[PDB]
Design an enzyme around this catalytic site. Structure first.
Site, mmCIF file in Angstrom:
data_model
loop_
_atom_site.group_PDB
_atom_site.id
_atom_site.type_symbol
_atom_site.label_atom_id
_atom_site.label_comp_id
_atom_site.label_asym_id
_atom_site.label_seq_id
_atom_site.Cartn_x
_atom_site.Cartn_y
_atom_site.Cartn_z
ATOM 1 N N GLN A 9 0.759 -1.235 0.000
ATOM 2 C CA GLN A 9 0.000 0.000 0.000
ATOM 3 C C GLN A 9 0.797 1.298 0.000
ATOM 4 O O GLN A 9 1.777 1.455 0.731
ATOM 5 C CB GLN A 9 -1.008 -0.021 1.143
ATOM 6 N N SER A 89 3.374 -6.680 2.912
ATOM 7 C CA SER A 89 1.930 -6.775 3.189
ATOM 8 C C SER A 89 1.196 -7.345 1.969
ATOM 9 O O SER A 89 1.289 -8.547 1.696
ATOM 10 C CB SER A 89 1.379 -5.393 3.570
ATOM 11 N N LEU A 90 0.462 -6.503 1.242
ATOM 12 C CA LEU A 90 -0.233 -6.952 0.039
ATOM 13 C C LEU A 90 0.773 -7.617 -0.918
ATOM 14 O O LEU A 90 0.449 -8.574 -1.627
ATOM 15 C CB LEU A 90 -0.882 -5.755 -0.662
ATOM 16 N N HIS A 194 -2.115 -3.959 10.085
ATOM 17 C CA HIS A 194 -1.183 -4.774 10.861
ATOM 18 C C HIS A 194 -1.190 -4.506 12.360
ATOM 19 O O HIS A 194 -0.143 -4.313 12.991
ATOM 20 C CB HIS A 194 0.224 -4.644 10.272
ATOM 21 N N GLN A 243 -0.625 -12.830 8.902
ATOM 22 C CA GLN A 243 0.043 -11.602 8.459
ATOM 23 C C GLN A 243 -0.815 -10.356 8.732
ATOM 24 O O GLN A 243 -0.306 -9.320 9.174
ATOM 25 C CB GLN A 243 0.329 -11.668 6.953
#
Lengths: 305, 305
Positions: A9, A89-90, A194, A243
């Site tokens: 992101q 992340s993504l 997160h 995650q």
């Protein structure tokens, strides 16, 4: 050899992937498949509005499609697959698509859901995220002790740490860290990514992820949770969910890759964020962002002229 | 006949201006001049950290430098000066530099202060900002009625409006807008840009600007305040300060341009944000974003001498 890295992101931008789309038959195919899977995706990616693209549920699939597109364009131009892969992340999902663990279409559908889940998890205004710079991790942890509703969300580079959770809790941490001579900057996000506040999103994604078939990756793919390469499909399924509420151990992944012998890193898709983290974290390393023809060619040169 | 548009906050990113820097000597030297005036700027623009670049006191100079560099690259390559120019908030300053109203060195120092001033205007946490899409202005105003410290900050597109003000106030409006089927990119912790709350930033910049000589622009430059072209330096000075607390009337500016007979719009610097707004606002019109060699090439093909 090099390690493939995929952005998360904030790395999106209107126009992302267009140049490669026009110069690479492979990128074109990936992106078209993405359009078919999520109609309207390309319009958002290429002409915005950039606010609309920035919506978590659009941004995530956009970044994954662009990352995979750039990667395939690289292979098509003669580049070799990576020795290891990781994603922020993504980006971890993108790495998995690259490694063949997930099909592209399933991945896109899943991350659009992930983004939507994540956004509607916390009421607008009740959450916040902030980047803490110029302060060693240990001091940050010490300053957050006793504070409730605030936790480490990203471990991006030494003295580049992101915290998040309840807005008020984050604000108060910001005050403490500030007094500690740290540079604190709130991120333009409403969702405390997160953090334990994302729990609702994880639970919901678990139901959708359950129907998806996972295969063993072609090359090891790191987990933001364990900071270690993962290759077992069901363990992968578990970690992709964990995650969501666990901190992104980016620094440790980078360090571990270096120990494995990796000295070159390529960031696919868009932006040069991860590239910056690499150099700031590992200095004798070489990092490049493959997001357009020029960057693509540059990457090929360093890997094989 | 084309109009030059320069981006404001949000159009920045790590890596901004790098492509043109190494491809165009004209652009390269503008940026080296920028680095000379503001030591470290290039490092922030290219390496980051991202959050550091996002800080208004860095983000504004960076955007102005990239904007002017792209414009110079275009002119040196034989491109023709615009009939009319405009910039979104910070971008207005960029347009005045391209127009010759003030010197790049002066502008760079001025916008760094402008960024810093805005940053400390309101205490961290008492201000918030939110972008609202999918709804016409009329509906947003209605939904806003009765709400205290919340104001219309930007009129970017027919269905793209930015509101800002007191944190608690902005939130309530957000909740009301979502309820009203609207989409929102909410920033829980942010300076309330372009709201009456930015007054102290305005009052402070007034002294610094008082010391800078201003000249008549070589081409008309729109004011986000009046939504009309301005050419009188005494008025421009006043209007640049008033802009800080006034709403950015972007939609109106574009409309007037269209009425002046402008058919092509060139956005200089980085990102395609303004291009996205031009598209969603004017439909029989052409727009391009000059931020790298490829887009530079294409702009020249349609607007070079």
């Amino acid at each position: 050899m090099y390690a493939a890295l995929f952005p998360g992101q904030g790395s999106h931008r209107v126009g992302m992937g267009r140049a490669l789309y026009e110069a690479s038959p492979a990128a074109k195919e990936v992106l078209d498949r993405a359009e078919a899977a999520l109609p309207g995706l390309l319009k958002l990616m290429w002409e915005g509005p950039e606010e609309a693209l920035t919506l978590t549920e659009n941004q995530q699939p956009a970044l994954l499609a662009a990352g995979y597109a750039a990667y395939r364009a690289f292979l098509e131009a003669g580049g070799k697959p990576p020795a290891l892969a990781a994603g922020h992340s993504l980006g971890e999902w993108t790495a998995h698509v690259a490694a063949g663990t997930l099909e592209l279409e399933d991945a896109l559908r899943l991350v659009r859901l992930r983004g939507r889940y994540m956004q509607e998890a916390v009421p607008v205004g009740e959450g916040a995220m902030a980047a803490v710079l110029k302060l060693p991790l240990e001091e940050i942890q010490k300053a957050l002790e006793g504070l409730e509703g605030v936790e480490i969300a990203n471990l991006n580079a030494p003295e580049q740490t992101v915290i998040s959770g309840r807005r008020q809790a984050v604000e108060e941490a910001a005050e403490r860290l500030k007094e500690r001579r740290a540079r604190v900057v709130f991120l333009p996000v409403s969702a405390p990514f997160h953090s334990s506040l994302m729990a609702p999103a994880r639970k919901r994604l678990a139901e959708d992820l359950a129907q998806v078939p996972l295969r063993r990756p072609r090359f090891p793919v790191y987990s933001n949770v364990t900071a270690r390469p993962e290759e077992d499909p069901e363990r992968i399924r578990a970690l992709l969910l964990e995650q969501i509420t666990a901190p992104v151990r980016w620094v440790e992944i980078l360090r571990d890759m270096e120990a494995r012998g990796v000295k070159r890193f390529l960031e696919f898709g868009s932006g040069e964020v991860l590239k910056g983290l690499v150099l700031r974290t590992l200095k004798e390393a070489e990092a490049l962002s493959v997001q357009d023809p020029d960057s693509l060619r540059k990457a090929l040169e360093v890997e094989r002229a």
